[PDB]
Amino acid sequence: HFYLETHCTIAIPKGEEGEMELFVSTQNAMKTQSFVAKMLGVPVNRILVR
Amino acid sequence: EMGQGLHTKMVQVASKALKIPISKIYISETSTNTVPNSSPTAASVSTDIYGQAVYEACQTILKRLEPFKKKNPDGSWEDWVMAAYQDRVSLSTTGFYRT
Amino acid sequence: ADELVFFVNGKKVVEKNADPETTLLAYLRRKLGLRGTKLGCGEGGCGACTVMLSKYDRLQDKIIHFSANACLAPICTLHHVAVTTVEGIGSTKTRLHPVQERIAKSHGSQCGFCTPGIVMSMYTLLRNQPEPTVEEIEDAFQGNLCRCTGYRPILQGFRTFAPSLFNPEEFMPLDPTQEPIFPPELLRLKDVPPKQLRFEGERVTWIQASTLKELLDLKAQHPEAKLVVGNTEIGIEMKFKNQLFPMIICPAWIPELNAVEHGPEGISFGAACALSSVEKTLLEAVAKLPTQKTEVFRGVLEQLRWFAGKQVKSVASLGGNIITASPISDLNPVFMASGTKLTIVSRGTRRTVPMDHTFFPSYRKTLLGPEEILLSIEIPYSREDEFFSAFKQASRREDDIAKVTCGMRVLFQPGSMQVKELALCYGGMADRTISALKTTQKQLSKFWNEKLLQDVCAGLAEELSLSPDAPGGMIEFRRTLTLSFFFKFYLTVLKKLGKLDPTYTSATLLFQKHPPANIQLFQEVPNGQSKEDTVGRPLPHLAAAMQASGEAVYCDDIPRYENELFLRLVTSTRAHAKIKSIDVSEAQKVPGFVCFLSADDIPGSNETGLFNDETVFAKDTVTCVGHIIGAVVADTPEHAERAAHVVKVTYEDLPAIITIEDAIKNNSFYGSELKIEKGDLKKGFSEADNVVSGELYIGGQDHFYLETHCTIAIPKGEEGEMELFVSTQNAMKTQSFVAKMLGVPVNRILVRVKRMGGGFGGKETRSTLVSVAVALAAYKTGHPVRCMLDRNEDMLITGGRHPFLARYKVGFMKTGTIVALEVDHYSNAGNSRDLSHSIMERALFHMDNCYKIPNIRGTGRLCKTNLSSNTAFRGFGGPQALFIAENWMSEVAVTCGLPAEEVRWKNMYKEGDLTHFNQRLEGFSVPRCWDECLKSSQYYARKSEVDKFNKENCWKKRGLCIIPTKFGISFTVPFLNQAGALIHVYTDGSVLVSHGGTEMGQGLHTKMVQVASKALKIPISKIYISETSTNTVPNSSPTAASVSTDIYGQAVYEACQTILKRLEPFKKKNPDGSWEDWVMAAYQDRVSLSTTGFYRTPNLGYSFETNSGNAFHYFTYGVACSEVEIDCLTGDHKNLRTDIVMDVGSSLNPAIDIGQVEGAFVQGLGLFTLEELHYSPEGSLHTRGPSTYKIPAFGSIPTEFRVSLLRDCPNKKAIYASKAVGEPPLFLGASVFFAIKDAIRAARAQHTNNNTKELFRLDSPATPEKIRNACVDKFTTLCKPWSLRV
Amino acid sequence: CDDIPRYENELFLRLVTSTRAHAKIKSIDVSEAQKVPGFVCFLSADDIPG
């Protein structure tokens, strides 16, 4: 692909109810959200992807 | 937005639908807590589908503003919006499209 | 510099560059990332920063655990000490400790900001005593404050350590064997010889002296060196008194300074011993030695009962209190009167002298030389024929500064009543501890009799005089206390010499705590209701566990960006003046200084405020002390603070208008008169049998939310975009005010509110003062910026409840029936309009309370003054008007000579009546609440018991009063009664709910989660609410008017319906499927799982012009009965019992609603009896901290506290038949005020006069000063024109 | 994404990837990595909570 900007993610752990806010260079915020939730083992509503 | 100008086009669409300058419209970002279960931005259909969703949401706004426009035809967009707010009419809505 | 080594939660910490000025709180929060411990006042009076400290005591060869305020603990005093914070005992990520579990499940946590501190006070107690008594449990919190709960649930939940809202049987038992162990490494270090340590900071050098020899050499070389042990004085001087001590010597480690010796003359304590140690030793001594030898010890112990709290007493040293020599020291008067011996030393010298009047030559000075230090103190045993007494009276019993405090001793000739020695020493009557020598000397060789009592009182009145301008004011009260204390001493000695009149006995008793009794009654949910349907059940606040664990994130707990700067506001020191110039040349020298911002830096508009009558930054003129002139931005909070303090502003004073009286005299108002008039007054007064006229005043109130105002502003650098995290109930106005100041479209600004550690109306608008200033700083620097106000800044700048002045005239019949009423209200609004108008409207809306008044006229006027702009405070004007109403109603009863409850009842509205603003009262439940409260409180039976007590007691009286209330539900501003919600169902079936309301501790999100769960028919575990944000729900009204549940509940409900309709087709095609199955099917069929919900309260719109239209959607009602006991000699009082019956319709959550009732009730109790703000004549606020502003404490609540929610009273006007509960209960606190007034009448009938129909004025708050002064007697009287017309 | 300011306590992650096309992982030794200044931790499969 050689997108000038390579893959990148910032993950912010809240410390409350498994909440995590992420800033990601992706075309798929949905799958990013569910995949991160699946790995953490928390409901999808706890994950915010921006 | 990955450089293809999707937000520009959506602002262009919203401006045409609402019939107001683009300068009054803004798109800041994409987030899972504003629009959920979104398909990845792909298949070159983003303009097609999000354009329709934005279009519908705009239509819902116009309908809610219609009574106020009719009562004050020579007023400004700002006048109608404020009147709507004070009359406790919601100025927030979703839009959706399915090919 | 030596390395500082200590432990935090078992983890070793090595600080190679310890700064002497760094507090443990700052270190925990900024260096260790442990944000569970909070900053609530920075002056040791709130306990929000409480932590536990553990160390190996060399002299006791044992590990000791004690609590301490992290805000006053210099980390430099913690070498080889083990710290335990809330995070160290448990968490929701691992497992909650029993203390955390119980306070959470017992509903002892609302906003949650005070929880960690209280959790640690309780934890510390249990580490010292695994099975404490109820007494010990209550005493554990003398230094912890809570503004939300009303304390009852916290005490009741913890009492377990010694339908229903909670079930104790579910609580995990406490098991000491599983507690974290004392760090092994520290236990090894105990075997290493102590060595002197040196720490070097930016401005201070700290020397930890290991031996007495090193201490004396250090003092010989540096006589100026300031000693520090507990730092509970030095810390205050450094933080608030602008003091800087270049060199500090901490002698805490020195054995001689910590030694305890039992001698033949008394018990000696090293000057470094903590007051808690002295207290422990004296208690043991009092239990083992003959009563006749412990007279002085018991005096010391009585003062220690009311000396700060556990956190301060565990670190505060003896020497510290003695040498600080404060005018209001509670110990020096006792040490002086008892001639306690002081052993003073310096390198090469040593002397021992008994403390006497000469030891304190002048203000803050003692007779010690510059090279000397106090080594030890010997508290004497009392001898035969020797008696002692110690008394203290303040504004609040617990953790307060003495108004007058004393030590009194008398020595008689062997077996006689003939005085040999007499010492009466007082604190709080001069700029130093003094002895009434002139007076006492005249009694030597005299006998203890009535004549001596009279002579001493007259002597005291003349010798302890106070000039009208005496600092602290309360001239009459203080002088009266000096005589009253002696009277108490006099009677007490007669008793000890023994015959004493039975009605005088109680005057000699020391405060006695009575056992608590609490009962909460509510209604069980329908028999067949599903377990997953939580509406109507006492579900604990969803974040309570995280608040008890310190994991709950509040604004400042959010991590700072590496490049984030800090802002400190620069405010006016003048009430009204022109700004001639501003010089920052000095501020520019403070390290880390970045810039000074002012009006000229604003890119958009400097016009702000609800009514556009305010400035973001003062321009040309300042109109109140605290008026924001500009702000300093620096790399650290300290640097910003220090720089802002040296910014020099040159002023030129302008005529100022401070008081309501000044305003009226100068015709200084905002807008024109407000008024509601119905009927024919002239006719009404013409038919009345009696007419009463009067004036009444009610003081203001500071919100004192445990978490002060705070804002973080992140500038994006793109298109003017800015993202802010704010502690506010109004994200919408925050957003538009920031946008207006920046000159950018509102759609560029994002405001996010997670939760507030309290709001109470104080964050409805005034939070913008900070938010806008921070946004400007972020805009100008391009860096993220933040600012959290210190308590003193918050209390000075942000405004509070509106003080009210009322002039009334009521006409009534001999039967007590009201026929006419005219009331003119005046509120002190401050330097801007803000919410003052709407507040006055609500006041006028409630001038009737629950009474039908055929002919009535009420006016309101907003006074424009040079004081910070006052704003919304739980009640929004209602409490003031309701208070004024009950005042004249009480005067009508007395005038008529009829039982107050009879007069109130016969004047009460009836189902279907119209109010003075012509709204029909439908479903008027006051009658039911009234009868049930009269019955459950056993009002009548107790009424006779009160009269009996008053006949058997001359210097103590009891009062009983039952009052009702009604509160109109809905914003006075029609268009604000709107609410929106946004709901998303993700593909795993989990639901994310978002609405316009914010969480400030009232449990709104919890209730909304409960509502969504019921509507969707799924467990609450599948629903979540993360925060409130302007980009999910726009144009939201502030979370206020107690209608958030009502309106957001409907919006959430409507959004859920839409979801159900969309899922219906898939549910039908697969009836046996799960929620998850239907959700996934909808998604794959391309059916949107996102929708909005909206609600608009119907038919609202009252007009003060036509006195027509619906102002409210419905009314919330309640009744409260309270009993008190007053000390006619001191002004102190006890809230014996309170019974409340509240109608909240079918409660959505009885646990949260009872918590709102109890909490609102305690804030009202505070407004009417304890809380008072004092201002200089020039308009400068004196009370800027918990030390001087006394809100209710754990020990302030009714000992017997009963609350019942009216059963079977569904409200068809709101979501699931519930009713708003936030503000309605607050006025009920007035029942305590009127019970007090009832008691004062008893006291006046006893000593003042015989006019059983006399109407004496009693303004609010009924503080100890007002109560004591009202109890006119021979003493108040003791504390002459040429001619007089005949 | 990376232009977003880092929090003062923000840490950095570096992936550890396979240098073989197909093989069994016999063991992982981080004793050397632990010596690098600023090292915080090595994460692997077992650390995943979900």
Ligand SMILES: Cc1cc2nc3c(=O)[nH]c(=O)nc-3n(C[C@H](O)[C@H](O)[C@H](O)COP(=O)(O)OP(=O)(O)OC[C@H]3O[C@@H](n4cnc5c(N)ncnc54)[C@H](O)[C@@H]3O)c2cc1C
């Ligand atoms: C919330 C709060 C509530 C309080 N409540 C009360 C109250 O109810 N009644 C009351 O009287 N006080 C009260 N205090 C005041 C304070 O706690 C006492 O004065 C305390 O005992 C001082 O002890 P310290 O060790 O903390 O003093 P520090 O602040 O450590 O030292 C105080 C002063 O004593 C000097 N000093 C200390 N030890 C020696 C020595 N051995 N020889 C010579 N000089 C010495 C120091 O140089 C310094 O000037 C309160 C303070 C707070 C913050």
Ligand SMILES: Nc1nc2c(c(=O)[nH]1)N[C@H]1C(S)=C(S)[C@@H](COP(=O)(O)O)O[C@H]1N2
């Ligand atoms: N714990 C706590 N309770 C509180 C407050 C608060 O700040 N903290 N605010 C009060 C005020 S002034 C109001 S108007 C209502 C607002 O919330 P509600 O509409 O959800 O009841 O809660 C009341 N109860």
Ligand SMILES: O=c1nc2[nH][nH]cc-2c(=O)[nH]1
């Ligand atoms: O009528 C109102 N009642 C209120 N309580 N708290 C804030 C309020 C408001 O703005 N308006």
Ligand code: FES
């Ligand atoms: S912050 Fe320490 S006592 Fe309030």
Ligand code: FES
């Ligand atoms: S819960 Fe204690 S101050 Fe809010």
Ligand code: MOW
């Ligand atoms: O915000 Mo209620 S007074």
Ligand SMILES: [Ca+2]
């Ligand atoms: Ca005002």
